[PDB]
Structure 1
Amino acid sequence: GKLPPGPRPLPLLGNLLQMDRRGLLKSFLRFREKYGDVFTVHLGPRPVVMLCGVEAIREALVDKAEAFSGRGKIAMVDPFFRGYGVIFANGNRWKVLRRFSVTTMRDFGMGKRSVEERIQEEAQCLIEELRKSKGALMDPTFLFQSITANIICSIVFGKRFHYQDQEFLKMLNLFYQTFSLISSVFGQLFELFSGFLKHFPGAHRQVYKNLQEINAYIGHSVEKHRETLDPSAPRDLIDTYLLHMEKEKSNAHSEFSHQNLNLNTLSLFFAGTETTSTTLRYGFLLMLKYPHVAERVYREIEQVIGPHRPPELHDRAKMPYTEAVIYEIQRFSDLLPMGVPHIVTQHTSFRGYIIPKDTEVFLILSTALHDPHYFEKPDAFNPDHFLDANGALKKTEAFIPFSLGKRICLGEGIARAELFLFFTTILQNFSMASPVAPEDIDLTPQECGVGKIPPTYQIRFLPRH
């Protein structure tokens, strides 16, 4: 047939006057109830196919990966990245780079210090800092952003930064800033009417500016790296890349070397940004609303790890309640209700509809995370959602906060490690508190733009002896 069905569009407004205010996703859900799991929405002049439910998403990224493994455009930032980097690249440029980063993560810490090892130290760093607090009320946004960044700085640069380092705090704010700029009213509108709306200055000019600045730091650092390279003792991800380049220069067709080192790197920071920090931020609001969940976790830790030695990844298996409490957190948080845009690469038949080469496509993962067929009463927080009768860990087809298929999250490994190690280590050492009663805690996500973001909150961490 043709493009899946959906609301009657206007000429260059598409379906935009029909949306909700300001529950965009909430709009998408109203269309769902009218059109099914496979509708088309005209976001401005552009046609975008939406897909809901596990079956649909899976049919597309897994069953039909030949077609649906494209990355869709993101106007606010494509003028900078220009197609470079794992999250942004398509075709051969991506296939070549995805592979390299994959093998590099796989073999990292083979020679040098392991990712776990890095997370553990950041963790211990974190706790001292949290203790230095002396049980004071704080907003932890800053720190969580810090620790997550640090882990990627550790991987890529071979080092972490002191939480007070100003060179650091500046760089950080530059990211956060760039993000909320794309999250804004404008960045939204820029993504639509960029065709004409790029001439004028906007937040897009500012965003390039901010990305350019950060990029200066990466180029500088790559140089410092070329000047201290030991071919037989790679310290970091940079060191590994630069080496790949040389062995690569002795080929004939280095698709790899024709690529912008800096951007690739920046893009990796971008990807991992605002990622875990948000989840963790959400995590501890939840532990304030459900303290009895917090206490149980602690007890498991005390039971399995005890009060002194640093939790480690191996503990995971033996701690199913915690792995469940973490899973439910991710599920409930719905970081990216809509994934990251895809485009289809070949013309394709999907549920007897005909989708054209180059159509943008959204996998609405919120709908998988909230499938009442897999999660009883899905709008509430419940770890049990990942436990059986026994209380053994219960994994499901539906928990795909990381998407599925070829483009599936590059940092899942890393991500899951962070969440565990940070979550347990904090909790090993501190109980939580807040001026606000559990039953007064508002969980309502901000849903500002394309991400879900928890409301802001005061928290204090409390030591145990």
Structure 2
Amino acid sequence: GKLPPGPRPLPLLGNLLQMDRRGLLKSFLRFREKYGDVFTVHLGPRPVVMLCGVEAIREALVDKAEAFSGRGKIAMVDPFFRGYGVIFANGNRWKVLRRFSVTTMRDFGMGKRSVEERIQEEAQCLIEELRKSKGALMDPTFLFQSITANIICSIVFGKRFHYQDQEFLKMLNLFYQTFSLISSVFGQLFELFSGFLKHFPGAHRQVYKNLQEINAYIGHSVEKHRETLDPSAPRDLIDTYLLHMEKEKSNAHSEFSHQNLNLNTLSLFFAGTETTSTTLRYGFLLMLKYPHVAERVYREIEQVIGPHRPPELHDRAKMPYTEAVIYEIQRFSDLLPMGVPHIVTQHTSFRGYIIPKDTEVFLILSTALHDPHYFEKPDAFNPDHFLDANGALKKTEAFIPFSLGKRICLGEGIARAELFLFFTTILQNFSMASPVAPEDIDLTPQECGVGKIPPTYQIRFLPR
């Protein structure tokens, strides 16, 4: 009849005074102790429903996809995206952009590389770069971003950028800084009080700026493509979209607009780069802390692939330990602890509550990934979380780091291919070292908000 229960709010402040200063997720986890898996928190001016645990999350997104499939705003980036592009769209725009993006992130031109071949080539460029690093220390972020960006770059722009390209790296810096700022304490506070805080200086302005700087490139690239576009031979995702645009041009309301083109593209890049990159960063920090796991992966690589032949997607089936380690990396690293906000699209009953149209809903994917019934000792990194007693791969319906239902990560397929190929191709050719002994490696995230972001760290890649 009413909203889910939760702490009693104040006017203006919502439940500010009941929050935990360590952040939104920690706040919410404390509410769950008291209220259970379904509860309401007033984030500044508004109510927001939190759903926790895999059962409630799956009930909402899968059993009730007709109601829970809308997209809410992320206050730090809404003034940039404004409902354009597939991540932040709703209604028919979302339908159109989703169908477009899924198709063009899957099917490429006449005789163009598969996703797998694109990742395999990128991985060879990476291991050549690592060989040329001569075991030097580095923070591998730029490379992890490079390789993931370059996959999307091959689909969207028909090209890759060289790791030495300073303009490429500049754009990668902006993706890195932006995700951090968004995930910062200010960005979490901004989610509560954007109506107030937006009038002052702050990191919201820096994020807007960063995003515009990236978007400027995309605009320009769109202009260049429009200038050389061959309708008989589209080169890439941009041409394909330009084609649709030309086809629907007599419709003033076509969703194939220039703003959707720029911001959809930016969306794909942001989500395509920074997610997988961050996962690899955590992944290798975890390998430094648990060298026995990496040695064990290497054994499996040796025994299944050998030292020479490039890993291929077919290899997954035979490498349960390695797939387990990647599952566990993704589980532990908990990229988007609160997922991406949704919003009910119609009045919905949910577990005897009534959640009205337009209410924001956070699916707290972190609660599924740390569910102690599915994962013994969920706070620890342990690949056996994903193996049975025989050492066979043990998948579980709790593993929902890409979410579920209509808005499920559209890049799931690509990200899993990337994680598998990049991870195994690196481990096949290199072992890792660093100046920090494993016992001293601190896994505490540098930021934990919309994104969980690992600390910076130095690493060496030692040729085998």
Tell me if both proteins adopt one fold, taking TM over 0.5 as the criterion.
yes
Q: In 1, Cα distance between the equivalents of 2:2 and 2:253?
A: 40
Q: Is the CA contact (8 Å cut-off) linking 2:25 and 2:449 kept in structure 1? A: no
User: Which residue in the other structure is 2:118 paired with?
Assistant: 118
Q: CA deviation at 1:247?
A: 3.7
SS in 1 for 2:70: coil
Cα deviation for residue 290 of structure 1 reads 1.5
Give, in whole Å, the separation in 1 of the partners of 2:377 and 2:448: 24
Q: Taking structure 1 as reference, are residues 139 and 92 closer, same or farther at Cα in structure 2, changes over 3 Å only?
A: same
Paired with 1:436 and 1:186, the residues of 2 have a C-alpha distance of 30
Q: Distance in 2 between matches of 1:205 and 1:434?
A: 36
Moved more, 255-264 or 394-403: 255-264
The structural deviation recorded for 1:23 is 4.2
Query: How far is the alpha carbon of 1:272 from its aligned partner?
Result: 2.3
Q: 1:316 to 1:419 in 2, by over 3 A?
A: same
Larger mean CA deviation between 114-123 and 328-337 belongs to 114-123
1:279–1:333 Cα contact (<8 Å) kept = yes
Which segment drifts farther, 227-236 or 61-70? Answer: 227-236
Q: CA deviation at 1:289?
A: 1.6
Does residue 258 (structure 1) correspond to residue 278 (structure 2)? The answer is no
- Counterpart of 1:87 in 2: which secondary structure? coil
Could you say which residue in structure 1 is the equivalent of 2:341?
341
* Distance in 2 of aligned mates of 1:45 and 1:253: 33
**Are the structure 2 counterparts of residues 189 and 23 from structure 1 closer, same or farther at C-alpha, using a change threshold of 3 Å?**
closer
2:139 touches 2:458 (CA, 8 Å); kept in 1?
A: yes
How many Å apart are 1:235 and its aligned residue?
2.1
Q: Work out whether residues 65 and 406 of structure 2, in 8 Å CA contact, stay in contact via their aligned partners in 1.
A: yes
Compared CA separation, residues 439 and 213, structure 1 to 2 (3 A) = closer
1:232 match: secondary structure: coil
SS at match of 1:363: strand
* Equivalent pair of 1:152/1:269 in contact (CA under 8 Å): yes
Is the 2:138–2:460 Cα contact (8 Å) retained in structure 1? Answer: yes
Q: In the aligned structure 1, how far is the partner of 2:234 from the partner of 2:205? A: 37
Measured at CA, do residues 377 and 236 of structure 1 come closer, stay the same or move farther in structure 2, by a change above 3 Å?
A: same
TM-score (norm 1): 0.95
Point out the more displaced range, 323-332 or 444-453: 444-453
The alpha carbon displacement at 1:182 in A equals 2.3
Query: Quick one: distance in 1 between partners of 2:288 and 2:209?
Result: 39
Tell me which moved more, 357-366 or 15-24: 15-24
- CA distance in structure 1 between the partners assigned to 2:298 and 2:94 by the alignment: 42
Indicate conservation of the 8 Å contact 1:112/1:235, yes or no: no
How far residue 156 of structure 1 moved from its aligned partner, in angstroms, is: 0.8
Give per-residue Cα distances to partners, 1:416-446, cap 9 Å, x unaligned. 1110110000001001112222222222223
1:217-254 Cα shifts (integer Å, max 9, x gaps): 11111121122223333222112212233344488974
1:23 touches 1:447 (CA, 8 Å); kept in 2?
A: no
In the aligned structure 1, how far is the partner of 2:115 from the partner of 2:42? 43
Deviations 1:309-356 (A, max 9, x none): 211111111211111111011011101111000111100100000111
Q: Is 1:430 aligned to 2:430, yes or no? A: yes
Q: CA offset at residue 453 of structure 1?
A: 1.6
Partner secondary structure for residue 431 of structure 1: strand
How far is 1:154 from its partner?
A: 1.6
In the TM superposition, residue 273 of structure 1 has moved relative to its aligned partner by: 3.5
Deviates more, 1:73-82 or 1:105-114: 105-114
Cα distance in 1, alignment partners of residues 190 and 402 from structure 2:
26
Q: Percent identity?
A: 100
CA spacing shift, 1:205–1:436, aligned 2, 3 Å: closer
Unmatched 5+ residue regions in structure 1? Answer: none
Kept in 1: contact 2:85–2:263 (CA 8 A): yes
Greater displacement, 264-273 / 404-413: 264-273
In 2, Cα distance between equivalents of 1:229 and 1:86: 23
After TM superposition, the structure 1 stretch with the greater mean CA deviation from structure 2, 37-46 or 104-113, is 104-113
**2:171–2:214 Cα contact (<8 Å) kept:** yes
The farther-off stretch of 88-97 and 245-254 is 245-254
* Partner Cα separation in structure 1 for residue 453 and residue 165 of structure 2: 26
The 1:459–1:95 alpha-carbon spacing in structure 2 relative to 1, beyond 3 Å, is same
Alignment of 1:32-47 (within 5 A): 32-47=32-47
Q: Which moved more, 1:189-198 or 1:286-295?
A: 189-198
Equivalent position SS for 1:40: strand
Distance 1:199 1:21 in 2: 23
User: In angstroms, what is the RMSD of aligned CA positions?
Assistant: 1.8
Aligned equivalents of 1:120, 1:210: Cα separation in 2: 31
> 3-state SS of the aligned residue for 1:375?
coil
Task: Quote how far apart the aligned CAs of 1:209 are.
Answer: 2.3
Matches within 5 A, 1:275-290: 275-290=275-290
- CA distance in 1 between partners of 2:195 and 2:150 (Å): 37
Aligned to 1:28: 28
Change (3 A) 1:206 1:332: closer
Residue matched to 1:397: 397
1-side partners of 2:186 and 2:369: how far apart?
A: 29
Q: Deviation per CA, 1:69-104, whole angstroms, max 9, x where unpaired?
A: 111012222222221111100011001110111122
1:48-75 Cα deviation digits (max 9, x unpaired): 1111111100000000011111110122
User: Residues of 2 paired with 1:206 and 1:137: CA distance?
Assistant: 30
* Distance in 1 of aligned mates of 2:453 and 2:50: 22
Q: Which moved more, 1:114-123 or 1:200-209?
A: 200-209
Deviates more, 1:87-96 or 1:112-121: 112-121
Judge conservation of contact 2:387–2:394 (CA < 8 Å) in 1.
yes
CA distance, structure 1, for counterparts of residue 353 and residue 309 of structure 2: 57
Q: Is the 8 A contact 2:87 2:267 kept in 1?
A: yes
Contact 1:112 1:234 in 2 (8 A): no
Query: Contact 1:248–1:257 at 8 Å: present in 2 too?
Result: no
For 2:205 and 2:281, the matched residues in 1 are separated by: 30
Query: 2:286 & 2:157 partners in 1: Cα distance?
Result: 33
Offset of residue 360 of structure 1 = 0.8
How far off its partner does 1:389 sit? 2.2
SS class of match (2:190)? helix
Query: Under a length normalisation based on structure 2, what TM-score does the superposition of the two structures give?
Result: 0.95
The match for 1:445 is 445
Q: What SS does structure 1 have at the residue aligned with 2:426?
A: helix
Residue-by-residue CA offset, 1:98-146 (whole Å, 9 max, x unaligned): 0111122332266422221111111111111111111112211221122
1:380-401 deviations in whole A, cap 9, x for unaligned? 1111111122222111110000
Indicate if the aligned counterparts of 1:93 and 1:256 stay in contact, CA closer than 8 A: no
**Alpha-carbon deviation of 1:166?**
1.4
Is the 2:5–2:39 contact (alpha carbons within 8 Å) kept by the matching residues of 1?
yes
Cα distance in 2 for partners of 1:25, 1:251 equals: 44
Q: 1:259 Cα deviation (Å)?
A: 5.6
Residue 232 and residue 302 in structure 1: after superposition, are their counterparts in 2 closer, same or farther (change >3 A)?
A: farther
3-state SS of 1:409 partner: coil
Question: 1:365/1:409 Cα in 2 relative to 1: closer, same or farther (>3 Å)?
Answer: same
